[PDB]
Amino acid sequence: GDRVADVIESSIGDSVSRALTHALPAPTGQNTQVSSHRLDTGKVPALQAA
Amino acid sequence: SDRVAQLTIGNSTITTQEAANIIVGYGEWPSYCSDSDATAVDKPTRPDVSVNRFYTLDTKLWEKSSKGWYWKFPDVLTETGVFGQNAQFHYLYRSGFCIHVQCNASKFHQGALLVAVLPEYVIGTVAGGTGTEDTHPPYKQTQPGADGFELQHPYVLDAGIPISQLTVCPHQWINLRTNNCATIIVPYINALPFDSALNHCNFGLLVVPISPLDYDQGATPVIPITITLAPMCSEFAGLRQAVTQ
Ligand code: NA
């Protein structure tokens, strides 16, 4: 048994692979949705940080 | 009521008092491309009235010895009006056409023209006559522009196929004792949803005299054949700078 707090609240032994991503079904190429003009500040999909 | 007709599209109206109905090629009216048949993702431009309207492009003289002529689509129009400009500025194009061929004479003249639309009208050469030379038709012959081109061997349509069977294609006849025009509506015909207006002619228009023109001396001898056509449901995509070839 374990009485000291640090042993009780320990994550030593966690065997579960925590995954940040997951597979989704994708039998066809993605479709294209209608889009219109956007003249807006703050929102900027073209700009990135490689 | 089958003989009188009015065609109005855009800022243009055509009238005829000696018609013979209207042919709708392959029994199908022109339409815009659906979202499931389409593949290109940019939003197309559909100019409407400024491009879907009648353009009168050329007049030929029917003579007792005429062989026949052909025009290629959309080639005939790539340098005319707002349609031409769009065909030049855009990579992709598609449209149907309303074709109205005109020819009036008098109740004392006679003759019959076959007016037909032949999709993918590939021109052949006489192969150096002996048939031993693999020669090819030059550009001015495959895409003659608004002037059209005269057939050298109408019987085989300059392509080794019988004009006697050309009626398996959308067509009408202009038989002078009966009518003075032919009207054919053609939907967009291609194995692709859109294509280049410059590199590819979807179909050719053929106007060939089958029963030669005749009349007695003293009757007006100048019998013109005028071609008027209108693009229908035009769509353009893939915009960049203007290109003519
Ligand atoms: Na972004």
First to last CA, chain A: 49
CB contact under 8 A, B43 and A35: yes
Which of the 8 DSSP states describes residue B167? G
**First-residue to last-residue Cα distance in chain B:** 44
Q: Is any Cβ of chain B less than 8 angstroms from the Cβ of A35?
A: yes
Residue B113 to residues B66, B69, B103: CA-CA distances in angstroms? 11, 11, 9
Three-class secondary structure of residue B38 per DSSP: coil
B43/A32 touch (CB, cutoff 8 Å), yes or no: no
A28 shares contact with chain B (CB less than 8 Å): no
Query: How many other C-beta atoms lie within 10 A of the C-beta of residue B173?
Result: 17
Distance from CA of B53 to the nearest CA of A (A): 28
Q: How far apart are CA B138 and CA B8, in angstroms?
A: 37
Whether chain B has a CB inside 8 Å of the CB on A32: the answer is yes
Cβ–Cβ of A34/B43 closer than 8 Å? yes
Report the C-alpha gap between B196 and B245 in whole angstroms.
10
- Buried b or exposed e, range A35-46, using 16+ CB within 10 angstroms: eeeeeeeeeeee
Chain centroid, CA A1 distance in Å: 37
Taken in order B119, B25, B107, B6, the sign of the CA dihedral is: negative
Cα(A49) to ligand 1 centroid in Å equals: 8
- The answer to whether the peptide bond before residue B119 is cis (omega within 30 degrees of 0) is no
CA of A40 from ligand 1 middle (Å) equals: 13
* Residue B145 CB-density burial (10 A; 0-12 exposed, 13-18 middle, 19+ buried): middle
Q: Which residues of A touch B43 (CB under 8 A)?
A: 34-35
* Residue A34 sits at the chain B interface (C-beta within 8 Å): yes
Structure tokens at B172: 């009408």
Give B232's contacts (C-beta < 8 A, 6+ positions apart): B9, B30, B52, B95, B96, B97, B98, B185
> How close, in Å, is residue A38 to chain B by CA atoms?
15
Domains of chain B, first to last: 1-245 (2.60.120.20)
> Residues B184, B25: contact at Cβ < 8 Å?
yes
Whole-angstrom Cα distance, residue B18 to residue B128?
Answer: 44
Experimental technique behind these coordinates: X-ray
Structural contact between residues B181 and B19, judged by C-beta atoms closer than 8 angstroms: yes
Q: Which residues of B touch A34 (CB under 8 A)?
A: 43
For the record, the structure tokens of B183 come out as 């009207």
Closest CA to B92 of B164, B39, B155, B159: B39
